[PDB]
C-alpha cells in the first residue's frame with residue numbers, strides 16, 4: 001500500500017452521487033482556501049474538473065455562478081467551463097484541455113512559464129476576447145441575476161474597500177493619499193460599466209497551441225462593473241507597452257474606451273494592494289496577513 005494525497009474512495013462516492021463515474025488517473029490541489037480542485041478521469045475517457053466547495057459559505061456561491069456561466073456560454077467566442085454538475089457539494093465540468101497562458105507548479109511562487117511578451121497572436125486574441133466579453137449586454141447579465149454596479153456603485157465599492165482596509169490595517173500615508181486622490185479624480189472613472197470577469201490574468205486564460213486565446217476559467221468574481229478591472233493584470237504582466245497594444249486592438253475590436261483609461265488601469269493595479277489585504281483579512285491566514293500588512297505599510 002502507498003499513502004496518497006487524494007482520498008479516491010471519498011472522491012468516487014461524491015462524484016457518483018452526481019452521475020459521474022471516476023476511473024483512472026487523478027490529481028489534487030488542496031491549496032485553495034475555499035475549494036478543493038481535483039482533475040479526474042471519468043469513464044467517458046475524458047478528464048473532468050471537480051470543484052469541491054469546502055464550507056457552507058462557499059457552497060452558497062455555486063448557484064449564482066452557475067447562472068452566470070449558463071448565460072455566457074453562447075455569448076462568448078471562446079470556451080468557458082460547462083458546469084454539467086453544479087450543487088452545494090460539487091461542481092464538475094469536462095476539463096478544457098488547452099493550457100493556461102501561464103504554467104505554475106502548485107505551491108510555487110514562481111511560474112514555470114508565461115506566454116511571451118512578443119507573442120502577437122496572444123496579445124491580439126486576448127484583446128479581441130476581452131472586447132467580446134465586455135460586449136455582453138447588460139440586459140443578459142440582469143436576466144442572469146448577476147451582481148450589477150453602475151458607475152457610481154463601482155466607485156463606491158472601491159471607496160468601501162479602501163475604507164475597510166483603513167479600519168483594519170495601518171497603511172502608508174502616501175498609499176492612502178494615492179487611493180483617495182484616485183477616488184476624487186473624476187476624469188479617471190468610466191461613465192459606464194460592463195460585464196467583467198473580475199479575476200482576469202494569464203493564469204485564468206486558456207490558449208491553444210498557437211497561443212491564441214481559446215477560453216477563460218475561474219469566473220467567481222464576474223459581475224457588471226468597471227472595465228479596467230479586467231485590464232490591470234495585463235499591465236502588470238506585459239507592462240505599459242503591452243497595455244498600449246491591448247488598448248489599440250480592444251478599441252479597434254469595438255471595446256469602449258475613454259481618454260484616461262490607461263491611467264485608470266494603473267490606479268486599479270495599485271488598488272490590488274487593497275484587494276489582497278481584504279482577501280488576507282477574510283482568509284484568516286496569518287501568512288497572507290503578514291504579507292498584506294508588510295505591503296500596506298511600505299511605500300509604493
Ligand SMILES: CC[C@H]1OC(=O)[C@H](C)[C@@H](O[C@H]2C[C@@](C)(OC)[C@@H](O)[C@H](C)O2)[C@H](C)[C@@H](O[C@@H]2O[C@H](C)C[C@H](N(C)C)[C@H]2O)[C@](C)(O)C[C@@H](C)C(=O)[C@H](C)[C@@H](O)[C@]1(C)O
Nearest residue numbers: 108109110111199200201203232233236237272275276279
Ligand atoms: C504573473 C503570475 C503571478 O500572478 C499575479 O501576479 C497576478 C497578476 C495576481 O493578480 C493581481 C492582479 C489582480 C487584478 O487580480 C487578477 C489583483 O486583484 C490581484 C490582487 O493581483 C494574482 C492572480 C493574485 O491572485 C489573486 O489575488 C486575489 C487577492 C484573489 C484572487 N482571486 C482568488 C479572487 C487571486 O486570483 C496573486 C495574489 O498574485 C496570486 C499569488 C498566489 C501569487 O503570488 C502568484 C504566485 C502570482 O505571483 C503569480 C501567479 O505568479
Ligand SMILES: Nc1nc2c(ncn2[C@@H]2O[C@H](CO)[C@@H](O)[C@H]2O)c(=O)[nH]1
Nearest residue numbers: 037049095096097098099100203217
Ligand atoms: N487547462 C485548464 N486548467 C484548469 C481548468 N479548470 C481548472 N483549471 C486549473 O485549476 C485552477 C483552479 O480552478 C485554475 O486556476 C487552473 O490552474 C480547465 O478547464 N482547463
